[PDB]
Amino acid sequence: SPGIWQLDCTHLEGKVILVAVHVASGYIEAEVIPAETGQETAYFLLKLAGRWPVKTVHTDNGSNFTSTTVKAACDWAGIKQEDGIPSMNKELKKIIGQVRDQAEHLKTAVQMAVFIHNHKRKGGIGGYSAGERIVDIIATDI
Amino acid sequence: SPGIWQLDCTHLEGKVILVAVHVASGYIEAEVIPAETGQETAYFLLKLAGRWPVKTVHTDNGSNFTSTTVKAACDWAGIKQEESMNKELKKIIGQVRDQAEHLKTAVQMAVFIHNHKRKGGIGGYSAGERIVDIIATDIQ
Ligand SMILES: O=C(O)c1cc(F)cc2c1OCOC2
């Protein structure tokens, strides 16, 4: 449960957003990238894995993820790929829409949407944000 | 304090590596940027704050930091403005540099290596363990 991420892509304004979701908490990492190439995907994963302890990624089995470039990055990071193995994503497009007019460029609106997402309290004033849940799940001591 | 980071640039192959160190843990976040512009800095600070609860960042004197874009980004994210971990990271990028085509790749490998690495004996901890433990403890 703590090491499992789901990667998905979304296409917005003719641009591609790569989204990684930490399945257990709802916490997200996201980046606008040039196009869905093996090198861009490898580089996103290497960055994700250097920040969070990533054991397994579930992917949509796109051509970017069957490349040897991505397989190699995953081997180097000790990440197991599960390609093709099983709509928050809609609310991210929503959030991006509600910050869009404070930033000139899509990439800035994406990072603002990431911030709002990971800070939002889910389940009422009684609840926890994704950012709070992920550290809770992942922490090894107290 | 759980909320305190320090940011530093190191120049290399005619680009800039922007480094933020979570002071209490030694955990590191880093990026290779074209130059130390206010726009790059502000974008970097916004990414950091969307991922970790940043309360305060300590920085050098530079013009990037008092830029209008950086003040807007700080104000929005709720961030208040104002080394051996760095010496270590520069050492690691050196030791991996040749394993990779682009600098940005060598830098991300060094960060992975740095944040995963256990310090001390059988009962020690990595920086990525310490940051998560400090924050989780603060929440409780
Ligand atoms: O909602 C929060 O305050 C929070 C707490 C964390 F420990 C870690 C993160 C948090 O949100 C920002 O993203 C990461």
Q: How far apart are CA A66 and CA A33, in angstroms?
A: 18
Phi, psi of A24, rounded to the nearest 5 degrees? -70, -30
Q: For residues B75, B77, B80 and B83, what is the CA-based torsion angle, rounded to 10 degrees? A: -140
Distance from the Cα of residue B119 to its chain's centroid = 19
Residue type present at position A136:
D
Which residue among B49, B112, B140 sits closest to A50, beta carbon to beta carbon?
B112
Say whether B29 sits in a helix, a strand or coil. strand
Interstrand relation of B118-119 and B125-126 (parallel, antiparallel or unpaired): antiparallel
Distance CA(A107)–CA(A103), nearest Å, equals 9
Question: Is A75 strand, coil or helix?
Answer: helix
Q: Do B129 and A108 touch (CB under 8 A)?
A: no
Phi, psi of A40 (to 5 degrees): -70, -35
Cα gap B118→A44, rounded to integer Å:
24
Largest CA distance in chain B: 48
Q: How far apart are CA A101 and CA B31, in angstroms?
A: 26
Q: Which residue, among B17, B67, B59, B20, has the nearest Cα to B42 in the 3D structure?
A: B67
Residue whose token pair is 């130390």: B36
For chain B, state the CA radius of gyration.
15
Pocket of ligand 1 (CB under 6 A): A 118-119, 129, 131-132, 135; B 51-53, 135
Contact: B139, A136; criterion CB under 8 Å: yes
Q: Which two tokens stand for residue A134?
A: 């992920």
The architecture in CATH of the region B1-140 reads 2-Layer Sandwich (3.30)
Distance CA A8, CA A30 (A): 10
Closest residue by Cα to residue A141 from B128, B50, B49: B128
Residue B58, class by beta-carbon neighbours within 10 Å (0-12 exposed, 13-18 middle, 19+ buried)?
Answer: middle
Q: What fold, for A1-142?
A: Nucleotidyltransferase; domain 5 (3.30.420)
Q: What is the resolution of this structure in A?
A: 2.1
CB contact under 8 A, A107 and B53: no
Q: Which letter does DSSP use for residue B117 in this model?
A: P
Residues counted in chain A? 142
Half-sphere exposure of B112 (CA within 13 A, CB side): 23
**Residue B117 has which token pair?**
């690495």
Helices (H), chain A: 38-51, 63-66, 68-77, 88-99, 106-119, 130-138
* Nearest residue to B19 (alpha-carbon basis) of B11, B28, A70, B126: B28
CA dihedral B110, B114, B116, B121 (to 10 degrees): 140
Contact A79, A54 (CB under 8 A): yes
Residue B7, strand partner residues: B20
Task: Give domain limits for chain A.
Answer: 1-142
Q: Indicate which technique resolved this structure.
A: X-ray
Where does residue A124 fall: left (phi above 0), alpha (psi -120 to 50 degrees), or beta otherwise? left
Nearest by CB to B139, from A43, A53, A135: name it.
A135
